[PDB]
């Protein structure tokens, strides 16, 4: 049962890795439209400001 | 100019609700298949665990 | 010899646990 608690600590350490990646993934998703599209949509807008 | 884009809208939007519904229908089909799997694998983990 | 058949099965499970560790940390280590 220390062999089985070691699989259950693999699951609770895989939770800790799933959260490590997914708190980065939520932060990459809540940013990437503010970065890459965050320059292309700024030229897209400056050519509307240039149109008037 | 009004009809082509108000029809692109009317056709696309009656598709987007169905396209979200069909991504959610793939999720629903996965939920039934994951049940049929879960009630056998996690349902032999059952004699440690159980199903639905 | 008959205990060594079971020990060599555990040694194949260790050689397989290597490939599972190799596969899972590779799912964690990731593209452009």
């Amino acid at each position: 049962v220390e062999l089985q608690e070691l699989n259950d600590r693999f699951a609770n350490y895989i939770d800790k890795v799933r959260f490590l990646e997914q708190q980065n993934k939520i932060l990459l998703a809540e940013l990437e439209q503010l970065k890459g599209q965050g320059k292309s949509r700024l030229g897209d807008l400056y050519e509307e400001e240039m149109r008037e | 100019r009004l009809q082509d884009e108000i029809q692109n809208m009317k056709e696309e939007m009656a598709r987007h609700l169905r396209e979200y519904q069909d991504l959610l229908n793939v999720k629903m089909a996965l939920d039934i298949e994951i049940a049929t799997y879960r009630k056998l694998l996690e349902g032999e983990e059952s004699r440690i665990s159980l199903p639905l | 010899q008959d205990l060594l058949n079971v020990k060599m099965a555990l040694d194949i499970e260790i050689a397989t646990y290597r490939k599972l560790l190799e596969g899972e940390e590779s799912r964690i280590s990731l593209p452009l």
């Binding site: 062999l3 089985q4 699989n7 259950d8 693999f10 699951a11 | 694998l41 996690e42 983990e45 004699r47 440690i48 665990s49 | 008959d2 205990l3 060594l4 058949n5 079971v6 020990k7 099965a9 555990l10 499970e13």
Partner: peptide, 19 residues
């Protein structure tokens, strides 16, 4: 964790027969 281990049960029977 849904792997209540079968390879442990096959490892027991081998190490038990070796013993």
């Amino acid at each position: 964790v849904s792997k209540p281990d079968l390879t442990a049960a096959l490892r027991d029977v081998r190490q038990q027969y070796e013993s």
